[PDB]
Amino acid sequence: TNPLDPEEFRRQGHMIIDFLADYYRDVEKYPVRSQVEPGYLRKRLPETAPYNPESIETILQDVTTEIIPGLTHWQSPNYYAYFPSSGSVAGFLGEMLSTGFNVVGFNWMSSPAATELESVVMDWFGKMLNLPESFLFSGSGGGVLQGTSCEAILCTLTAARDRKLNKIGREHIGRLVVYGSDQTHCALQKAAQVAGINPKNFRAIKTFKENSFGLSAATLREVILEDIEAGLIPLFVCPTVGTTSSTAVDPISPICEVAKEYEMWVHVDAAYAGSACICPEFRHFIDGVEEADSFSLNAHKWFFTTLDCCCLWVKDPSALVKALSTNPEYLRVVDYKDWQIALSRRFRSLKLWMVLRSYGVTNLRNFLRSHVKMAKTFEGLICMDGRFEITVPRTFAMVCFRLLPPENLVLANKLNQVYLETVNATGSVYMTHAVVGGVYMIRFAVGSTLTEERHVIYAWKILQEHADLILGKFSEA
Template sequence: MTADLDPDEFRRAGYAFVDWVAEHRAALPGLPVVPPVRPGEVAAALSGPGAAFADGLLPEAPQPLATLLDEVERVVVPGSTHWQHPAFFGYFPANASLASVLGDLLSGGLGAQGMLWSTSPAATETEQVLLDGFARALGLGEAFTFPGGGGGVIQDSASSAALVALLAALQRADPRWQESGVDGRERVYVTAETHSSLTKAVRVAGMGARALRVVAAVPGTQAMSAAALADAVAADVAAGLRPVLVCATVGTTGTGAVDPVRDIAAVTAAHGAWLHVDAAWAGVAGLCPELRHVLDGAGLADSFCTDAHKWLLTAFDASLLWVRDAAALPAALSVTPEYLRNAASESGAVVDLRDWQVPLGRRFRALKLWAVVHAAGLEGLRAHLRGHVAAAVALAARVRAEPGVVLAAPPTLGLVCLRCVTADGGPDDAATRAVLERVNASGAAFVTHTVVDGRYVLRIAVGGVVTEAAHVEALWEQVRREAAAVRGPSTSSH
């Protein structure tokens, strides 16, 4: 006997669940962004007497699905950091538009396992068509499309994209790598601002910390120096080492720094190293012609990644990875046991996307991205991006005009970094930290921090699905008030 809902039961429950999501999203502006909970409180509420998991045990008998919504309302919502709140300015955006939620519903409803073309032809080819279309819309060039000899795939995250790019780079550097493993001579080049996923990828690949080279930045910036990279690579080659991969970042997590990809590409081409461009947050800005300058040189890369689940209205997880050589990832990742063999794969006429990622199984992620494109169109996506960039530009102008507060790094797209300064203009780390803590404790907004040149910096990332200029202005007024409060009455503000 099946334990599943029948179609009529599903329809009734589905209406209730959709209504709950709609009401929750409508109520978000009135909720605190960060929950006032202590560690263990959520678990205690779920496992206490009469709760969902009383005494820590799973229920033996079926429970009405309506009670699940009750528990979510009672426990989950008050214990959640609300990433979809219009005043969420921390980390980077985690867009989960309602259109993408509906696309996820379709994906779950189909229940496809798209590991092979033969296990779901529609899942594979829809993804190919979408990724080809985005490669063109971003200006990456035809070389990153399947007809052009490359192609794209939806990974779960930019971390996974970095790992598979590294594995492909190792394979290209030494085709014997799959049998013999790394030999200790391989080197990967990053900056101090490169995402930590590259460090993790090096570990996962068994290369060890010695494989990672941190390249100096252009003086006065956080962006990689192509000259310093050239020197580091040349020194390693002279020492008998093997440059495998360089990661250039477009929009670093800390400050939004943009590495000079075109200049870096000249260095990697001279030494045969793989160039991976991590544009997880900022890459989608290339949809706007006036913002595409941040992607200058990206078309010269071997691989390029940007996340639809950060700033492109698509619910997590949906990281878009392209390669110039469609054979590169399968060469590094393909393992084919007998039970996966089939006529379509062996014909060479299809793409099996399980060979483009680490896991075997894969969801039909393309449906939620398709839903976003269907609902917004490229015009709507560009308007979404442009509105946030304009709000960040206005915020940066206010910071420049405010005594006691300065920009800590050049603003990039929707990211503004600032810090408090003392009366003589020196960094005031204690005041900056206090402002962040007071803003977050209020529940009215949420911001995060980074450290630049050893100094504490407050980051404001503008990019939420429903975040508008008014929300950014309200945050700024709160930052001004808190900065004035922690500085004391001797410092004027206007």
């Protein structure tokens, strides 16, 4: 029997759809964070591949009993850890079609729709975000669909690297400096390592509570002037709208004005919070992006396409091409492989296309709004409880709070750590933490697609029930 037999495809396909619909219907029964022990799976599974085939009915049962227990349910309506793994039916069907077609977007000829639909949706999504025409295909720029924002940052950093090193000489790679906040995600540092940036030439600029931990352009100018006086070349600054720890925001406009002075490439990283700027009341968070060179968000984080789909807009696609193309430098229809790392591109445009058509701009705006409203509600319940405290301002549907004690910081930090792990150990909910400004913080990030208001309130009661429990027996130890 052919491994791609259409009728067996139809038969087994309907089974997995029923399996997944059953999973989504029952997901609340599982503990959110997996409770298996390290190595549990290597001991339950054999050590060699089977010589003979096994039935899909046998495999699906093993999925139920061996795999699902070792899952941490990001799709659970009770998952508030990290950032969301934002899914939808439309996104799933897009990946299903892409997987089903299984074409390789090596070039435009390899599937013209896989190349052209991407250029259309990137313009669709850009215009929703009110990106200037310098980022669009209608105007002077272009957009590309990539897997992760780390890869997105790697390419732009390489493009900026090649732009500078092609002018002053390749031998000066050891002087290029990469600038970010001490809240910037580690994807920036990782790209700098791969791109050949010297490890001691990475800058994690200090941020202050006075600015709610957003990078101050004046502090950046000071660091640049020191680097310049030390014989170093400033290369690349990456302000973040929505840092992963306390959802801090960097002021884009003054940062690019500082970067214009010193001929620096600016990448605006809006990996999580970027999708909300289709709502006009949030679009101010990326004001100044008109002056930046590149812009990226993770659609798989907050825009209902399944993992993974990172959307990257650039003003000058040529810069990416010159750095990433393998055709000779005297050579450098869109060929998206020259815009990214992967040569065998996936048909990621279907995901974004399906999410846009099946919901429309209006519903998508309301989806993000409901997560924020739910987080504003969670913020309100916390403020009304004198035992809790909001640590930093809430900006996009994430709330950072801590339980107060009845230094004082080291105690409050130890209290919130023991508090959080007790809560997470129940399996009822799942939050992660962050240490910002020396303060341990619990993070409440409302983005799971199945999450509704009942789950948020359910989590709040579990927080205060454990608050009553732990604050009752304190003993300062």
